[PDB]
Amino acid sequence: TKYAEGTQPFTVLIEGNIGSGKTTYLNHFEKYKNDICLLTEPVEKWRNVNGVNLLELMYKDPKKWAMPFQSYVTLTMLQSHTAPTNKKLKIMERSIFSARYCFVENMRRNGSLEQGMYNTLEEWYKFIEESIHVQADLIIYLRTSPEVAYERIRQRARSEESCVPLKYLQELHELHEDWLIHQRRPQSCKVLVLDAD
Amino acid sequence: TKYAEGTQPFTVLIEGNIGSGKTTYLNHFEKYKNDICLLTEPVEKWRNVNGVNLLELMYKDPKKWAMPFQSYVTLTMLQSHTAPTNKKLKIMERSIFSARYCFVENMRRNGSLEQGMYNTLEEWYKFIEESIHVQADLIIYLRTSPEVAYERIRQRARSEESCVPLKYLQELHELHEDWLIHQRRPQSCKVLVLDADL
Ligand SMILES: Nc1nc2c(ncn2[C@H]2C[C@H](O)[C@@H](COP(=O)(O)OP(=O)(O)OP(=O)(O)O)O2)c(=O)[nH]1
Ligand SMILES: Nc1nc2c(ncn2[C@H]2C[C@H](O)[C@@H](COP(=O)(O)OP(=O)(O)OP(=O)(O)O)O2)c(=O)[nH]1
């Protein structure tokens, strides 16, 4: 009997690459703030962890900050997933699943996470499934190509993000495909694919 | 309500410095164990994480491995605290509180954990307090002098601990004192204090 079990409404998770328009898309729902639980834009927490910019330090030196940053991404997703609400509907930007299946996986391959770091995150993931309820009814995948995503990113112009390589966005693209289209990851609930170009 | 809430018996935590004799003390309880749930020797899980010796890496390279090590220390403590049992008593070696109030404190001070990593662990300690039930009814404190603790570390001769200086243990000792004697941390159920210099 997990933390947050039986407390959660029908839940939609908004997924897609960096710069796929996830926040923008959710913003359309803002006038319904009173009817829907909207948990958007988690980057803002990662940019300010009691005054520390974890997003910034992760980009500057990944072999040091990959793991603490991912640890914190996991915490914040867990806090949104299990956040309490009386509303009939919850919609979330991102989920614990993209952190696990896309980012963590990619940083393992790209070597930002050493084997030991990776195993830690993975045992934590096993324990979270066993102990904490993650409500998941529908994923909406804002599908984009890596070039489009790249362009949206540099226009938005986050100082932290100014050195993000297109290659990286292609690595991430693939993983979102493997997970959300080619059904290559263990997890499965309903997926709705939208084109966003 | 929290995970593991309602499912845990009266629970005792065995605390004290590195080398103070926690495992030894616990073995006195070994003939009883069909009636007592004994969760001993968590260092072993830290020495082999599907092959990886995190203890070794944390000692070889703290600025890089302190973070992921503490993160796994936390997990393994959570797995013990919330491990299910039908027995009327649980006795555990260490707890999540010594990692938070002794080791993490020290690693923050000696620079192994930068503010950002420390902030992250602290945020996690709060969410655990809200999500995960941690049963604690009694702590038994095996009080030693940092010098006896050192002798025992040397006699035991774990290869990971080969470079552990007396200063480290002095630092940790005063941290265990601030928590278990001066009560300068949150709760501490009751603390039974034991002289563990033979
Ligand atoms: N969600 C998530 N973001 C991560 C992770 N590791 C690094 N990041 C970074 C990549 C980005 O620089 C930043 C925000 O990425 P997201 O695509 O989650 O949010 P963003 O507002 O950029 O999405 P949007 O452009 O609104 O579709 O977080 C992770 O494990 N999970
Ligand atoms: N419990 C704990 N140990 C840590 C932490 N960070 C590093 N360590 C190291 C200190 C030691 O090298 C090793 C195990 O120390 P303990 O005092 O927990 O076990 P030990 O078997 O040395 O105690 P004992 O001799 O049985 O009283 O783990 C932490 O956050 N918590």
Side-chain angles (χ1 to χ4, degrees), chain A residues 126-181:
Chain A
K126 293 176 163 74
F127 179 72
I128 285 147
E129 302 174 38
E130 268 104 290
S131 82
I132 296 184
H133 182 66
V134 187
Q135 187 67 49
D137 295 284
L138 186 67
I139 301 170
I140 301 168
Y141 175 22
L142 304 185
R143 195 188 190 182
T144 60
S145 54
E147 302 163 59
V148 176
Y150 187 93
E151 180 52 13
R152 289 186 187 166
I153 294 164
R154 65 136 218 125
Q155 283 218 74
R156 176 178 65 206
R158 288 189 200 139
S159 78
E160 306 94 340
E161 292 176 345
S162 81
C163 296
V164 165
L166 181 66
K167 269 203 53 197
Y168 186 66
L169 291 161
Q170 287 165 332
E171 294 156 351
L172 289 180
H173 182 79
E174 286 309 315
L175 294 154
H176 283 79
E177 298 280 84
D178 289 348
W179 167 40
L180 293 164
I181 285 167

Short mmCIF file of all heavy atoms in Angstrom, two decimals, chain A residues 126-181:
data_model
loop_
_atom_site.label_atom_id
_atom_site.label_comp_id
_atom_site.label_asym_id
_atom_site.label_seq_id
_atom_site.Cartn_x
_atom_site.Cartn_y
_atom_site.Cartn_z
N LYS A 126 13.56 1.04 -8.80
CA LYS A 126 12.88 -0.16 -8.33
C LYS A 126 12.14 0.07 -7.00
O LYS A 126 11.03 -0.43 -6.80
CB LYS A 126 13.86 -1.33 -8.17
CG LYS A 126 14.46 -1.87 -9.46
CD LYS A 126 15.48 -2.95 -9.12
CE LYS A 126 15.81 -3.83 -10.31
NZ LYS A 126 16.68 -3.15 -11.32
N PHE A 127 12.75 0.82 -6.08
CA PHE A 127 12.14 1.07 -4.77
C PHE A 127 10.94 2.01 -4.84
O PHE A 127 9.98 1.86 -4.09
CB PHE A 127 13.16 1.59 -3.75
CG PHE A 127 12.56 1.88 -2.41
CD1 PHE A 127 12.16 0.85 -1.57
CD2 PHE A 127 12.34 3.19 -2.01
CE1 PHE A 127 11.58 1.11 -0.35
CE2 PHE A 127 11.75 3.46 -0.79
CZ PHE A 127 11.38 2.42 0.04
N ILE A 128 11.01 3.00 -5.74
CA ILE A 128 9.89 3.92 -5.96
C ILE A 128 8.63 3.20 -6.48
O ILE A 128 7.53 3.44 -5.97
CB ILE A 128 10.33 5.09 -6.89
CG1 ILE A 128 11.21 6.07 -6.10
CG2 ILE A 128 9.14 5.80 -7.51
CD1 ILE A 128 12.28 6.72 -6.93
N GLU A 129 8.79 2.31 -7.46
CA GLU A 129 7.68 1.50 -7.97
C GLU A 129 7.09 0.72 -6.81
O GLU A 129 5.87 0.66 -6.65
CB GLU A 129 8.11 0.51 -9.06
CG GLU A 129 8.80 1.08 -10.32
CD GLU A 129 9.33 -0.03 -11.26
OE1 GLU A 129 8.64 -1.07 -11.41
OE2 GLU A 129 10.41 0.13 -11.87
N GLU A 130 7.95 0.12 -6.00
CA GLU A 130 7.48 -0.72 -4.89
C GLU A 130 6.77 0.08 -3.78
O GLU A 130 5.90 -0.45 -3.10
CB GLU A 130 8.62 -1.63 -4.34
CG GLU A 130 8.70 -3.08 -5.00
CD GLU A 130 9.85 -3.31 -6.06
OE1 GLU A 130 9.80 -2.75 -7.20
OE2 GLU A 130 10.78 -4.12 -5.77
N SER A 131 7.08 1.38 -3.65
CA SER A 131 6.66 2.17 -2.49
C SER A 131 5.83 3.43 -2.74
O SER A 131 5.18 3.95 -1.82
CB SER A 131 7.90 2.60 -1.71
OG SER A 131 8.51 3.74 -2.30
N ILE A 132 5.86 3.95 -3.96
CA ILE A 132 5.15 5.19 -4.23
C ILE A 132 4.27 5.11 -5.47
O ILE A 132 4.74 4.76 -6.54
CB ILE A 132 6.13 6.38 -4.30
CG1 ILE A 132 6.81 6.56 -2.93
CG2 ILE A 132 5.41 7.64 -4.75
CD1 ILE A 132 7.74 7.73 -2.80
N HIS A 133 2.99 5.45 -5.31
CA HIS A 133 2.02 5.41 -6.43
C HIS A 133 2.23 6.51 -7.47
O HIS A 133 2.13 7.68 -7.15
CB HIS A 133 0.57 5.46 -5.93
CG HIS A 133 -0.46 5.37 -7.02
ND1 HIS A 133 -0.62 4.24 -7.80
CD2 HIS A 133 -1.36 6.27 -7.48
CE1 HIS A 133 -1.58 4.45 -8.68
NE2 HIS A 133 -2.05 5.67 -8.51
N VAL A 134 2.53 6.11 -8.70
CA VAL A 134 2.59 7.06 -9.84
C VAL A 134 1.36 6.86 -10.74
O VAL A 134 1.27 5.87 -11.48
CB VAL A 134 3.87 6.89 -10.69
CG1 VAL A 134 3.94 7.98 -11.73
CG2 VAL A 134 5.12 6.90 -9.83
N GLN A 135 0.42 7.80 -10.65
CA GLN A 135 -0.81 7.74 -11.45
C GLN A 135 -0.51 8.10 -12.91
O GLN A 135 0.12 9.13 -13.19
CB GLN A 135 -1.87 8.68 -10.87
CG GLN A 135 -3.27 8.59 -11.52
CD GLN A 135 -3.98 7.26 -11.26
OE1 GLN A 135 -4.06 6.78 -10.13
NE2 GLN A 135 -4.50 6.66 -12.32
N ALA A 136 -0.95 7.25 -13.84
CA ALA A 136 -0.67 7.45 -15.27
C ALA A 136 -1.76 6.85 -16.18
O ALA A 136 -1.86 5.62 -16.32
CB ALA A 136 0.71 6.89 -15.64
N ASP A 137 -2.54 7.72 -16.80
CA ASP A 137 -3.67 7.30 -17.62
C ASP A 137 -3.46 7.57 -19.10
O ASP A 137 -3.89 6.78 -19.95
CB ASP A 137 -4.94 7.97 -17.13
CG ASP A 137 -5.32 7.53 -15.72
OD1 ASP A 137 -5.82 6.40 -15.57
OD2 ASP A 137 -5.12 8.31 -14.77
N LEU A 138 -2.78 8.67 -19.41
CA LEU A 138 -2.57 9.09 -20.79
C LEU A 138 -1.28 9.89 -20.95
O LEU A 138 -1.07 10.87 -20.22
CB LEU A 138 -3.75 9.95 -21.26
CG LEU A 138 -3.76 10.35 -22.74
CD1 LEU A 138 -3.96 9.12 -23.63
CD2 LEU A 138 -4.81 11.42 -23.01
N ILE A 139 -0.44 9.48 -21.89
CA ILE A 139 0.69 10.30 -22.31
C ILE A 139 0.35 10.92 -23.66
O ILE A 139 -0.06 10.22 -24.60
CB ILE A 139 2.00 9.48 -22.46
CG1 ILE A 139 2.40 8.81 -21.15
CG2 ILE A 139 3.14 10.39 -22.94
CD1 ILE A 139 3.53 7.81 -21.28
N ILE A 140 0.51 12.24 -23.76
CA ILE A 140 0.45 12.97 -25.02
C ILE A 140 1.87 13.31 -25.46
O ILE A 140 2.55 14.13 -24.84
CB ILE A 140 -0.37 14.28 -24.90
CG1 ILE A 140 -1.81 13.98 -24.46
CG2 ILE A 140 -0.38 15.06 -26.22
CD1 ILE A 140 -2.57 15.22 -24.06
N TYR A 141 2.32 12.66 -26.54
CA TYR A 141 3.67 12.84 -27.05
C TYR A 141 3.75 13.94 -28.10
O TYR A 141 3.32 13.74 -29.24
CB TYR A 141 4.14 11.49 -27.63
CG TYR A 141 5.48 11.45 -28.33
CD1 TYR A 141 6.47 12.41 -28.09
CD2 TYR A 141 5.77 10.41 -29.21
CE1 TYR A 141 7.72 12.34 -28.73
CE2 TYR A 141 7.01 10.33 -29.86
CZ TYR A 141 7.97 11.29 -29.62
OH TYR A 141 9.17 11.19 -30.27
N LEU A 142 4.28 15.11 -27.73
CA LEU A 142 4.47 16.20 -28.70
C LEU A 142 5.66 15.87 -29.60
O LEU A 142 6.80 16.21 -29.30
CB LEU A 142 4.66 17.57 -28.02
CG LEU A 142 3.58 18.06 -27.06
CD1 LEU A 142 3.90 19.47 -26.60
CD2 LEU A 142 2.19 18.04 -27.68
N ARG A 143 5.38 15.17 -30.70
CA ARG A 143 6.44 14.67 -31.55
C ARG A 143 6.98 15.79 -32.45
O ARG A 143 6.20 16.57 -33.02
CB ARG A 143 5.96 13.46 -32.36
CG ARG A 143 7.07 12.64 -33.00
CD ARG A 143 6.48 11.60 -33.93
NE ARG A 143 7.47 10.63 -34.40
CZ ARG A 143 7.20 9.64 -35.26
NH1 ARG A 143 5.97 9.49 -35.74
NH2 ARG A 143 8.15 8.79 -35.62
N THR A 144 8.30 15.89 -32.51
CA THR A 144 8.99 16.90 -33.29
C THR A 144 10.25 16.26 -33.83
O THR A 144 10.68 15.21 -33.34
CB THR A 144 9.42 18.16 -32.45
OG1 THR A 144 10.32 17.77 -31.40
CG2 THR A 144 8.24 18.91 -31.86
N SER A 145 10.86 16.88 -34.83
CA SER A 145 12.17 16.44 -35.28
C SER A 145 13.21 17.28 -34.53
O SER A 145 12.89 18.40 -34.10
CB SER A 145 12.29 16.57 -36.81
OG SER A 145 11.98 17.88 -37.24
N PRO A 146 14.42 16.74 -34.34
CA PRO A 146 15.51 17.38 -33.58
C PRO A 146 15.92 18.78 -34.04
O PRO A 146 16.40 19.58 -33.22
CB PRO A 146 16.69 16.42 -33.79
CG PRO A 146 16.09 15.13 -34.15
CD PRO A 146 14.82 15.42 -34.85
N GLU A 147 15.79 19.07 -35.35
CA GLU A 147 16.12 20.38 -35.90
C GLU A 147 15.14 21.42 -35.43
O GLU A 147 15.54 22.55 -35.15
CB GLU A 147 16.05 20.39 -37.42
CG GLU A 147 16.92 19.43 -38.14
CD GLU A 147 16.46 19.27 -39.57
OE1 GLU A 147 16.41 20.28 -40.31
OE2 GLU A 147 16.12 18.13 -39.94
N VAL A 148 13.86 21.06 -35.41
CA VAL A 148 12.80 21.98 -34.97
C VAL A 148 13.03 22.29 -33.49
O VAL A 148 13.10 23.47 -33.10
CB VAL A 148 11.36 21.39 -35.14
CG1 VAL A 148 10.32 22.33 -34.58
CG2 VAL A 148 11.04 21.07 -36.60
N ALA A 149 13.17 21.22 -32.70
CA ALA A 149 13.48 21.33 -31.26
C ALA A 149 14.68 22.23 -31.02
O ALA A 149 14.64 23.08 -30.14
CB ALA A 149 13.70 19.94 -30.61
N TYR A 150 15.73 22.08 -31.83
CA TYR A 150 16.93 22.90 -31.67
C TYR A 150 16.59 24.38 -31.84
O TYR A 150 17.08 25.23 -31.10
CB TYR A 150 18.05 22.49 -32.63
CG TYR A 150 19.34 23.22 -32.36
CD1 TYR A 150 20.32 22.68 -31.51
CD2 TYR A 150 19.60 24.47 -32.94
CE1 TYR A 150 21.52 23.36 -31.25
CE2 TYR A 150 20.77 25.16 -32.67
CZ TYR A 150 21.72 24.60 -31.83
OH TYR A 150 22.89 25.28 -31.58
N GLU A 151 15.75 24.69 -32.81
CA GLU A 151 15.49 26.07 -33.15
C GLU A 151 14.66 26.72 -32.07
O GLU A 151 14.94 27.85 -31.65
CB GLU A 151 14.82 26.19 -34.54
CG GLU A 151 14.52 27.63 -34.99
CD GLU A 151 15.72 28.58 -34.91
OE1 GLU A 151 16.86 28.11 -34.75
OE2 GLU A 151 15.51 29.82 -35.00
N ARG A 152 13.63 26.01 -31.61
CA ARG A 152 12.82 26.51 -30.51
C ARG A 152 13.68 26.80 -29.28
O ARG A 152 13.50 27.84 -28.65
CB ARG A 152 11.68 25.54 -30.17
CG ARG A 152 10.61 25.52 -31.23
CD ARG A 152 9.43 24.67 -30.80
NE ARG A 152 8.47 24.51 -31.89
CZ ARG A 152 7.48 23.62 -31.89
NH1 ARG A 152 7.31 22.79 -30.86
NH2 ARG A 152 6.67 23.55 -32.93
N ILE A 153 14.63 25.91 -28.99
CA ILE A 153 15.50 26.07 -27.83
C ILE A 153 16.30 27.38 -27.85
O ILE A 153 16.26 28.14 -26.87
CB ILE A 153 16.45 24.85 -27.62
CG1 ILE A 153 15.65 23.61 -27.25
CG2 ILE A 153 17.49 25.14 -26.53
CD1 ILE A 153 16.43 22.34 -27.43
N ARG A 154 17.02 27.65 -28.94
CA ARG A 154 17.89 28.82 -29.01
C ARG A 154 17.12 30.15 -29.03
O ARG A 154 17.64 31.16 -28.55
CB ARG A 154 18.90 28.74 -30.18
CG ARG A 154 18.26 28.76 -31.55
CD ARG A 154 18.98 29.69 -32.54
NE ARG A 154 18.00 30.37 -33.38
CZ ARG A 154 17.92 31.70 -33.52
NH1 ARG A 154 18.80 32.49 -32.91
NH2 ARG A 154 16.98 32.23 -34.30
N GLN A 155 15.90 30.13 -29.57
CA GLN A 155 14.99 31.29 -29.55
C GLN A 155 14.53 31.63 -28.14
O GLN A 155 14.55 32.80 -27.75
CB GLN A 155 13.75 31.03 -30.41
CG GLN A 155 13.97 31.15 -31.89
CD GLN A 155 12.79 31.80 -32.59
OE1 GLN A 155 12.58 33.02 -32.48
NE2 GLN A 155 12.01 30.99 -33.30
N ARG A 156 14.11 30.60 -27.40
CA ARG A 156 13.73 30.73 -25.99
C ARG A 156 14.91 31.28 -25.21
O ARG A 156 14.75 32.19 -24.39
CB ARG A 156 13.25 29.39 -25.42
CG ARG A 156 12.92 29.41 -23.93
CD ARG A 156 12.41 28.05 -23.45
NE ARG A 156 13.42 27.01 -23.54
CZ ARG A 156 13.15 25.71 -23.67
NH1 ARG A 156 11.89 25.31 -23.72
NH2 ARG A 156 14.13 24.82 -23.76
N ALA A 157 16.10 30.73 -25.48
CA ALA A 157 17.36 31.32 -25.03
C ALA A 157 17.61 31.26 -23.51
O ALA A 157 17.91 32.29 -22.88
CB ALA A 157 17.53 32.78 -25.57
N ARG A 158 17.50 30.06 -22.94
CA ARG A 158 17.95 29.85 -21.57
C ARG A 158 19.48 29.85 -21.52
O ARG A 158 20.11 29.02 -22.17
CB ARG A 158 17.40 28.55 -21.00
CG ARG A 158 15.91 28.58 -20.69
CD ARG A 158 15.51 27.31 -19.92
NE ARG A 158 14.08 27.09 -20.02
CZ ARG A 158 13.52 25.90 -20.19
NH1 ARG A 158 14.27 24.81 -20.28
NH2 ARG A 158 12.19 25.81 -20.29
N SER A 159 20.07 30.76 -20.75
CA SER A 159 21.53 30.81 -20.57
C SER A 159 22.17 29.43 -20.30
O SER A 159 23.21 29.10 -20.87
CB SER A 159 21.93 31.81 -19.47
OG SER A 159 21.73 31.29 -18.16
N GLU A 160 21.53 28.63 -19.44
CA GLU A 160 22.01 27.29 -19.14
C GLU A 160 22.09 26.40 -20.39
O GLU A 160 23.01 25.58 -20.52
CB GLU A 160 21.12 26.63 -18.09
CG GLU A 160 20.93 27.43 -16.80
CD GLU A 160 19.68 28.31 -16.81
OE1 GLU A 160 19.15 28.61 -17.90
OE2 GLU A 160 19.22 28.70 -15.71
N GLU A 161 21.15 26.59 -21.31
CA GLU A 161 21.00 25.71 -22.48
C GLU A 161 21.80 26.10 -23.74
O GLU A 161 21.68 25.44 -24.78
CB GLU A 161 19.52 25.55 -22.82
CG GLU A 161 18.73 24.79 -21.77
CD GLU A 161 17.25 24.71 -22.07
OE1 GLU A 161 16.76 25.47 -22.93
OE2 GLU A 161 16.57 23.87 -21.44
N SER A 162 22.62 27.15 -23.63
CA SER A 162 23.26 27.74 -24.82
C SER A 162 24.34 26.87 -25.51
O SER A 162 24.84 27.26 -26.57
CB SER A 162 23.79 29.15 -24.51
OG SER A 162 25.04 29.09 -23.85
N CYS A 163 24.68 25.72 -24.94
CA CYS A 163 25.69 24.83 -25.54
C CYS A 163 25.16 23.44 -25.85
O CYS A 163 25.95 22.54 -26.18
CB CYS A 163 26.90 24.67 -24.62
SG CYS A 163 27.83 26.16 -24.37
N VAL A 164 23.84 23.26 -25.72
CA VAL A 164 23.16 21.99 -26.06
C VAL A 164 23.39 21.60 -27.52
O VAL A 164 22.94 22.30 -28.43
CB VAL A 164 21.64 22.10 -25.78
CG1 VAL A 164 20.88 20.97 -26.44
CG2 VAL A 164 21.38 22.10 -24.28
N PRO A 165 24.14 20.52 -27.77
CA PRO A 165 24.35 20.10 -29.16
C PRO A 165 23.12 19.46 -29.80
O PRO A 165 22.38 18.74 -29.13
CB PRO A 165 25.48 19.06 -29.05
CG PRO A 165 26.02 19.19 -27.66
CD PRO A 165 24.88 19.66 -26.83
N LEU A 166 22.91 19.72 -31.08
CA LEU A 166 21.90 19.02 -31.88
C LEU A 166 21.99 17.49 -31.79
O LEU A 166 20.97 16.81 -31.79
CB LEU A 166 22.01 19.45 -33.35
CG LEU A 166 21.07 18.89 -34.39
CD1 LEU A 166 19.63 19.32 -34.18
CD2 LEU A 166 21.56 19.35 -35.73
N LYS A 167 23.22 16.96 -31.76
CA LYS A 167 23.46 15.52 -31.58
C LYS A 167 22.71 14.99 -30.37
O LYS A 167 21.97 14.01 -30.46
CB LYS A 167 24.95 15.23 -31.41
CG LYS A 167 25.70 14.94 -32.69
CD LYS A 167 26.97 14.14 -32.39
CE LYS A 167 26.66 12.87 -31.54
NZ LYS A 167 27.87 12.24 -30.87
N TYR A 168 22.90 15.67 -29.24
CA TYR A 168 22.21 15.36 -28.00
C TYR A 168 20.70 15.30 -28.19
O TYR A 168 20.05 14.34 -27.74
CB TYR A 168 22.59 16.41 -26.96
CG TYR A 168 22.08 16.18 -25.57
CD1 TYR A 168 22.53 15.09 -24.81
CD2 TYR A 168 21.18 17.07 -24.98
CE1 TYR A 168 22.08 14.88 -23.51
CE2 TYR A 168 20.74 16.88 -23.67
CZ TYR A 168 21.19 15.79 -22.95
OH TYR A 168 20.75 15.58 -21.66
N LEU A 169 20.14 16.30 -28.86
CA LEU A 169 18.71 16.32 -29.19
C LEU A 169 18.29 15.20 -30.14
O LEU A 169 17.11 14.84 -30.17
CB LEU A 169 18.28 17.66 -29.77
CG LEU A 169 18.28 18.88 -28.86
CD1 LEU A 169 18.30 20.16 -29.68
CD2 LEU A 169 17.07 18.84 -27.93
N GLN A 170 19.23 14.66 -30.90
CA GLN A 170 18.96 13.48 -31.74
C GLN A 170 19.01 12.20 -30.90
O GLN A 170 18.20 11.30 -31.10
CB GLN A 170 19.93 13.38 -32.92
CG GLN A 170 19.70 14.39 -34.02
CD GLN A 170 20.85 14.50 -34.98
OE1 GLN A 170 22.00 14.25 -34.62
NE2 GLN A 170 20.56 14.88 -36.21
N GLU A 171 19.97 12.13 -29.99
CA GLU A 171 20.04 11.03 -29.05
C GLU A 171 18.74 10.96 -28.24
O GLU A 171 18.14 9.89 -28.13
CB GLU A 171 21.26 11.15 -28.14
CG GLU A 171 22.62 11.01 -28.84
CD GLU A 171 23.74 11.69 -28.06
OE1 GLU A 171 23.42 12.42 -27.08
OE2 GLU A 171 24.93 11.52 -28.41
N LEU A 172 18.29 12.11 -27.74
CA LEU A 172 17.04 12.18 -26.96
C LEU A 172 15.81 11.84 -27.78
O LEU A 172 14.95 11.10 -27.32
CB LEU A 172 16.87 13.56 -26.31
CG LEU A 172 17.76 13.99 -25.14
CD1 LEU A 172 17.38 15.38 -24.67
CD2 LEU A 172 17.66 13.02 -23.97
N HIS A 173 15.71 12.41 -28.98
CA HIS A 173 14.66 12.06 -29.95
C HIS A 173 14.50 10.55 -30.06
O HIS A 173 13.41 10.02 -29.85
CB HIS A 173 14.95 12.66 -31.34
CG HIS A 173 13.89 12.37 -32.35
ND1 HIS A 173 12.69 13.06 -32.41
CD2 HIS A 173 13.83 11.45 -33.35
CE1 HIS A 173 11.95 12.58 -33.39
NE2 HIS A 173 12.62 11.60 -33.97
N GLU A 174 15.60 9.86 -30.36
CA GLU A 174 15.54 8.41 -30.55
C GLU A 174 14.86 7.77 -29.35
O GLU A 174 13.92 6.98 -29.51
CB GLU A 174 16.93 7.78 -30.76
CG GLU A 174 17.59 8.02 -32.10
CD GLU A 174 16.71 7.69 -33.31
OE1 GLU A 174 16.04 6.62 -33.32
OE2 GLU A 174 16.69 8.51 -34.25
N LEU A 175 15.34 8.11 -28.15
CA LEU A 175 14.87 7.45 -26.94
C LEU A 175 13.39 7.68 -26.67
O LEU A 175 12.69 6.74 -26.28
CB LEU A 175 15.73 7.83 -25.73
CG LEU A 175 17.15 7.29 -25.86
CD1 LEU A 175 18.10 8.14 -25.06
CD2 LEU A 175 17.25 5.81 -25.49
N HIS A 176 12.91 8.89 -26.92
CA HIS A 176 11.48 9.17 -26.87
C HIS A 176 10.72 8.31 -27.89
O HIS A 176 9.59 7.89 -27.60
CB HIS A 176 11.20 10.66 -27.12
CG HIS A 176 11.47 11.55 -25.95
ND1 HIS A 176 12.74 11.96 -25.60
CD2 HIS A 176 10.63 12.12 -25.05
CE1 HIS A 176 12.67 12.75 -24.54
NE2 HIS A 176 11.40 12.86 -24.18
N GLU A 177 11.32 8.03 -29.05
CA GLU A 177 10.69 7.16 -30.07
C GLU A 177 10.62 5.70 -29.60
O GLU A 177 9.55 5.09 -29.58
CB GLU A 177 11.43 7.23 -31.42
CG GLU A 177 11.45 8.60 -32.08
CD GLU A 177 10.16 8.94 -32.81
OE1 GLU A 177 9.20 9.42 -32.18
OE2 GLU A 177 10.13 8.76 -34.04
N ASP A 178 11.77 5.16 -29.22
CA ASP A 178 11.88 3.82 -28.66
C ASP A 178 10.87 3.60 -27.54
O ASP A 178 10.19 2.56 -27.49
CB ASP A 178 13.30 3.61 -28.12
CG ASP A 178 14.36 3.49 -29.22
OD1 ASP A 178 13.98 3.35 -30.41
OD2 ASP A 178 15.58 3.51 -28.89
N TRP A 179 10.75 4.57 -26.64
CA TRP A 179 9.84 4.45 -25.51
C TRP A 179 8.38 4.59 -25.95
O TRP A 179 7.56 3.73 -25.63
CB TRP A 179 10.21 5.43 -24.37
CG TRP A 179 9.15 5.59 -23.28
CD1 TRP A 179 8.37 4.60 -22.74
CD2 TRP A 179 8.77 6.81 -22.62
NE1 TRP A 179 7.52 5.13 -21.81
CE2 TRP A 179 7.74 6.48 -21.70
CE3 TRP A 179 9.19 8.14 -22.70
CZ2 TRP A 179 7.12 7.43 -20.89
CZ3 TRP A 179 8.57 9.09 -21.89
CH2 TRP A 179 7.55 8.72 -20.99
N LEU A 180 8.07 5.64 -26.70
CA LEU A 180 6.68 6.07 -26.88
C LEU A 180 6.00 5.64 -28.17
O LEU A 180 4.79 5.83 -28.32
CB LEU A 180 6.55 7.59 -26.73
CG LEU A 180 6.82 8.19 -25.35
CD1 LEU A 180 7.04 9.69 -25.45
CD2 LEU A 180 5.71 7.85 -24.37
N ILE A 181 6.77 5.10 -29.11
CA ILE A 181 6.21 4.68 -30.40
C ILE A 181 6.53 3.22 -30.70
O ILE A 181 5.62 2.43 -30.96
CB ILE A 181 6.64 5.60 -31.56
CG1 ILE A 181 5.85 6.91 -31.48
CG2 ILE A 181 6.39 4.93 -32.91
CD1 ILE A 181 6.38 7.98 -32.34
#
